[PDB]
């Protein structure tokens, strides 16, 4: 399997672009940024709203926990490669604690509204606008040869009042190389695509489109997360109960994949369930034909059949967003 678009970006660019184990950090001043209040975390870090002492503006401080040094160089190099791209979180400085050399990443501050509270207030149009904005970041990162690999609502900051979106958290991201087998232990469970769960390691930028589709399905069906499995195996079973197992078997045999037989038995045999069977009172003001048509072209087992970020932004579903953007 190879990417259908932007497959040669790293191929054609200099080794330094993508050779992040060779990064050379040019540390800033740890004192310029002060911690004001904890806003998030990961198994990987502590994230605080900070203040830039030199100009008084809010900032974000991402204090990294001890991990192999390559993991830190990777996240930094990707941020520097994308800095300036549409809706890509801006990395402002990199600083360390003299004593422990604990690295902290400094970012622009986005005044986010938690998605469990924001998403449910969104109008149909806003959903369209925000997914469109998130698509600009994904088309931009794919075009630069990088997969995000952790597309999910906690990694999408929205300042609703400013109608500003930033695709944050490039900590799992990677440079795309035609033919490389990648670890499949990436992304959040609800957003893991079929290829991660069936162990197809030579995946590409299309994994991010499956993750975007799960976010979209959650928004229009008012159901978070939309594929709610307790562990990986179960995550593939929740997928197979919606998409049907005929499609899966087509898919497994296309790429020459034999599932683990216990997994294979959990999965079982399920008829495809049309999308409209999730339509209800609460979500019917959001489930029209274009939404379904669009969602259907994102949530496909075959990563090769899924829309690319570029195709997705031109889908008719986003016509009004495009026109508003054009005048």
Q: Which alpha helices (DSSP H) does the chain contain, by range? A: 9-12, 15-18, 69-82, 115-118, 124-143, 194-197, 206-221, 232-243, 245-255, 261-267, 289-296, 309-313, 319-326
The answer to whether the annotation marks 40 as part of a ligand binding site is: yes
Handedness of CA 183, 184, 190, 191 (dihedral sign): positive
The answer to whether the annotation marks 45 as part of a ligand binding site is: yes
Which of 139, 150, 204, 208 is labelled catalytic? 150
Kindly list the distances between the CA atom of residue 113 and the CA atoms of 156, 163, 301, in Å, as whole numbers in the listed order.
10, 11, 32
Given the rule CB under 6 A, which residues bind ligand ANP?
A: 39-40, 42, 44-45, 47, 60, 62, 89, 107-110, 112, 150, 154-155, 157, 168-169, 171
Q: Mark the segment that binds Mg ion (CB under 5 A) among 123-131, 140-148, 169-177, 209-217.
A: 169-177
Q: Least distance (Å) from ligand ANP to the CB of residue 66? A: 14
The entry of Mg ion, ligand ANP, none that residue 186 binds, CB within 5 to 8 Å by partner kind? none
Nearer to ligand ANP, 187 or 307 (CB): 187
The answer for 87, left when phi > 0, alpha when psi is -120 to 50, beta otherwise, is left
The entry of ligand ANP, Mg ion, none that residue 157 binds, CB within 5 to 8 Å by partner kind? ligand ANP
Cα 207 from Cα 209, distance rounded (Å):
5
Q: Least distance (Å) from Mg ion to the CB of residue 107? A: 12
Regarding 155 and contact with Mg ion (CB under 5 A), the answer is yes
The verdict on whether 150 is a catalytic residue reads yes
Regarding 206 and contact with Mg ion (CB under 5 A), the answer is no
Nearer to Mg ion, 139 or 169 (CB): 169
Nearer to ligand ANP, 168 or 248 (CB): 168
Per DSSP, 31 falls in state: G
Per DSSP, 80 falls in state: H
Regarding 153 and contact with Mg ion (CB under 5 A), the answer is no
Give the SS3 label for residue 237.
helix
Vertex 146: Cα angle to 142 and 152 (nearest 5): 80
The entry of ligand ANP, Mg ion, none that residue 226 binds, CB within 5 to 8 Å by partner kind? none
Q: Least distance (Å) from ligand ANP to the CB of residue 90? A: 8
Residue in 75, 139, 169, 204 binding Mg ion, rule: CB under 5 A: 169
Query: Judging by beta carbons within 10 Å of its beta carbon (0-12, 13-18, 19+), is residue 269 exposed, middle or buried?
Result: exposed
The answer to whether the annotation marks 192 as part of a ligand binding site is: no
Cα 226 from Cα 238, distance rounded (Å):
9
**Count of positions on this chain that bind Mg ion (CB under 5 A):** 4
Which residue numbers are catalytic?
150
Q: Which residues are annotated as a binding site?
A: 39-47, 62
Q: Which residues are annotated as a binding site for ATP?
A: 39-47, 62
């Amino acid at each position: 399997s190879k990417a259908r678009v932007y497959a040669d970006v790293n191929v054609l660019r200099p080794k330094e672009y993508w050779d992040y184990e060779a990064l050379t950090v040019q540390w800033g001043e740890q004192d310029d940024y002060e911690v004001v209040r904890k806003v998030g975390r990961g198994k990987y870090s502590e994230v605080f709203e900070g203040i830039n002492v030199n100009n008084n503006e809010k900032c974000i401080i991402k204090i990294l926990k001890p991990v192999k040094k390559k993991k830190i160089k990777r996240e930094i190099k990707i941020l520097q490669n994308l800095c300036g791209g549409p809706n890509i979180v801006k990395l402002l400085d990199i600083v360390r604690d003299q004593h422990s050399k604990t690295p902290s990443l400094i970012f622009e501050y986005v005044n986010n509204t938690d998605f469990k509270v924001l998403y449910p207030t969104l109008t149909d149009y806003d959903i369209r606008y925000y997914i469109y904005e998130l698509l600009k970041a994904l088309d931009y990162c794919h075009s630069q040869g990088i997969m995000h690999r952790d597309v999910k609502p906690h990694n999408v900051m929205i300042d609703h009042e400013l109608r500003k979106l930033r695709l944050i958290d490039w900590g799992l991201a990677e440079f795309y190389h035609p033919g490389k087998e990648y670890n499949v232990r990436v992304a959040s469970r609800y957003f893991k695509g079929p290829e991660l769960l069936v162990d197809l390691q030579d995946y590409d930028y299309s994994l991010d489109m499956w993750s975007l589709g799960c976010m979209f399905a959650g928004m229009i069906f008012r159901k978070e997360p939309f594929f709610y499995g307790h562990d990986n195996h179960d995550q593939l079973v929740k997928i197979a109960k919606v998409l049907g197992t005929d499609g899966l078997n087509v898919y497994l045999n296309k790429y020459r994949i034999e599932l683990d037989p216990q997994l294979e038995a959990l999965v079982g045999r399920h008829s495809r369930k049309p999308w409209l069977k999730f339509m209800n009172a609460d979500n019917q003001h959001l489930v029209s034909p274009e939404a379904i048509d669009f969602l259907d072209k994102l949530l496909r087992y075959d990563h090769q059949e899924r829309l690319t970020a570029l195709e997705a932004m031109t889908h008719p579903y986003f016509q009004q967003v495009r026109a508003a953007e054009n005048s």
